[PDB]
Ligand code: HEM
């Protein structure tokens with residue numbers, strides 16, 4: 737798990753996201769969709785977005801970004817004690833949305849990228865380490881639920 741010090745770093749970094757949840761959420765999803773176009777195809781409601789300009793102009797994309805980061809933030813504030821929060825998300829993403837764990841790896845990487853892009857020189861090595869551990873814990877606990885369900889893709 738994460739140490740008390742590491743969780744403090746995670747939640748400090750998270751304050752940066754909370755100052756502009758929609759902007760961070762939008763950029764995370766755009767990074768995901770442009771880097772990995774197959775991910776867009778999982779969103780029937782974003783399939784029409786044929787260019788990054790269209791993505792940037794989509795108010796619904798920003799809305800979904802807010803929903804995604806709000807859910808993740810709730811999970812992070814549990815400092816690993818997130819079974820009740822995480823289980824339903826893992827199950828909706830496997831059974832309803834059909835999201836392979838690879839795509840969760842992609843979005844985790846996108847979050848790290850966006851933090852550096854929006855806060856260059858202000859996302860230190862310690863902070864990156866801690867946030868990476870938190871995202872890996874999130875992904876890994878989802879992976880355990882995916883295995884329970886026998887879900888791959
Ligand atoms: C940080 C990781 C993620 C979080 C916290 C998250 C959170 C959420 C939440 C809260 C919802 C709405 C409730 C629900 O259906 O369970 C949702 C819906 C959805 N998610 Fe995610 N999600 C994540 C990653 C992903 C990824 C990587 C994909 C696909 C590449 C994805 C695909 C979807 C889709 C297709 C929906 C339904 C969207 C709609 O049509 O309204 N999610 N997600």
Ligand SMILES: [O-]
Nearest residue numbers: 800801803804
């Ligand atoms: O999502």
